[PDB]
Point group: C3
Chain length 28, copies 3
């Protein structure tokens, strides 16, 4: 359970990073 | 604690999916 | 492990809210 929670949170982080990259290009 | 963590991640994933739609709508 | 997970989710929630506001300002 704990390892799956770490696994899912890390995937959210890289999903957050792509969202911030998308917004930065939109505002360009 | 573990059950609340799982729910928070599940709620976060649904917010991520809606954010992606808002960004895709902006690109249209 | 439990502390890092809860402190990582709290940071992700702050990012989600800022992303939602950034997207809302884009739609303005
Ligand atoms: Cl387990
Ligand atoms: Cl584990
Ligand atoms: Cl507990
Ligand atoms: Cl529990
Ligand atoms: Cl620990
Ligand atoms: Cl802990
Ligand atoms: Cu489509
Ligand atoms: Cu409002």
């Amino acid at each position: 359970q704990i390892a799956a929670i770490k696994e899912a949170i890390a995937a959210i982080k890289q999903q957050i990073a792509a969202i911030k990259x998308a917004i930065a290009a939109i505002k360009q």
